[PDB]
């Protein structure tokens, strides 16, 4: 599902990275963010019964939400995520066993990298769309610096994205941004409004 997923990220521009302390909290956050215009929703596997959160958000899937799994650190989590109907898989690092498994299952996997050597290793396993993490450390300047040497790599940072810098991130050449607490933290009313505000900022640039 790679070129479908790439165009989805390119079109929608923002992934909501959901951390939550419960299934109910995750689900209402996912909902609030989607209601605010965010169609790409990354359910982090630090969430209890993350696999069950995903399954149960199929009602939102029917609305056109693209729901995947984040912070996947094992093929076990990945199998569960995929079985639950994750449409994409994100990890903080590069896991070659998860790479293989997703190739096998035809599932779009976005591994994390932080260095050029890490990036090259990711590319050699077939990955050109990479999670930049943590984006607080490897910021817009990292994205820009990789453009020359690695012109076919496209980053989606998590960490270090807010309203005030999101445009700088796109100027640097990101495909999309992953956003956590700046978006998903607070009450569904507030999450919905932050989502709205994010979608508008990005449309603006």
In whole angstroms, give the CA distance from residue 139 to residue 169: 8
Which domain, by its residues, includes 133?
Answer: 1-205
Residue 203's nearest CA partner among 37, 74, 33 is 37
In whole angstroms, give the CA distance from residue 16 to residue 90: 12
User: How far are the Cα atoms of 17, 79, 117 from residue 34, in angstroms, in the given order?
Assistant: 12, 25, 36
Residues known to be catalytic: 42, 131
Q: Provide the sign of the torsion angle of the four alpha carbons 33, 38, 39, 40, taken in this order.
A: negative
Query: Is residue 19 marked as binding?
Result: yes
**Cα Rg of the chain, angstroms:** 16
Q: 195 with 32: CB under 8 angstroms?
A: yes
- Both tokens of residue 144? 């820009």
Burial classification of residue 34, based on how many CB atoms lie within 10 Å of its CB (0-12 exposed, 13-18 middle, 19 or more buried)? buried
3-state secondary structure 78-136: HHHHHHHCCCEEECCCCCHHHHHHHHHCCCEEECEECCHHHHHHHHHCCCCEEEECCCC
Q: 40 with 66: CB under 8 angstroms?
A: yes
Query: Is residue 71 marked as binding?
Result: yes
**CATH code of the domain in which 123 resides:** 3.20.20.70
- Both tokens of residue 3? 């070129």
Alpha helices in the chain, H assignment, sequence order? 2-12, 23-35, 50-55, 58-61, 75-84, 96-104, 116-124, 140-147, 166-172, 181-184, 188-204
Query: Is residue 46 marked as binding?
Result: no
157: enclosing H helix or E strand: strand 154-157
In whole angstroms, give the CA distance from residue 196 to residue 183: 10
Q: How many domains does the chain divide into?
A: 1
């Amino acid at each position: 599902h790679h070129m479908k997923m790439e165009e989805l990220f390119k079109k929608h521009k923002i992934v909501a990275v959901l951390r939550a302390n419960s299934v109910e909290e995750a689900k209402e956050k996912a909902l609030a963010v989607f209601e605010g215009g965010v169609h790409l929703i990354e359910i982090t596997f630090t969430v209890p019964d993350a696999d069950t959160v995903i399954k149960e958000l199929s009602f939102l899937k029917e609305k056109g939400a693209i729901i995947g799994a984040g912070t996947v650190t094992s093929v076990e989590q990945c199998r569960k995520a995929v079985e639950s109907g994750a449409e994409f898989i994100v990890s903080p690092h590069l896991d070659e066993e998860i790479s293989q498994f997703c190739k096998e299952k035809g599932v779009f996997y976005m591994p994390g990298v932080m260095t050029p050597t890490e990036l090259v290793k990711a590319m050699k396993l077939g990955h050109t769309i990479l999670k930049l993490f943590p984006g607080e450390v490897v910021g817009p300047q990292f994205v820009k610096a990789m453009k020359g040497p690695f012109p076919n790599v496209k980053f989606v940072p998590t960490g270090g994205v807010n309203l005030d810098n999101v445009c700088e991130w796109f100027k640097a050449g990101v495909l999309a941004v992953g956003v956590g607490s700046a978006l998903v933290k607070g009450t569904p009313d507030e999450v919905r409004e932050k989502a709205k505000a994010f979608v508008e900022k990005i449309r603006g640039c």
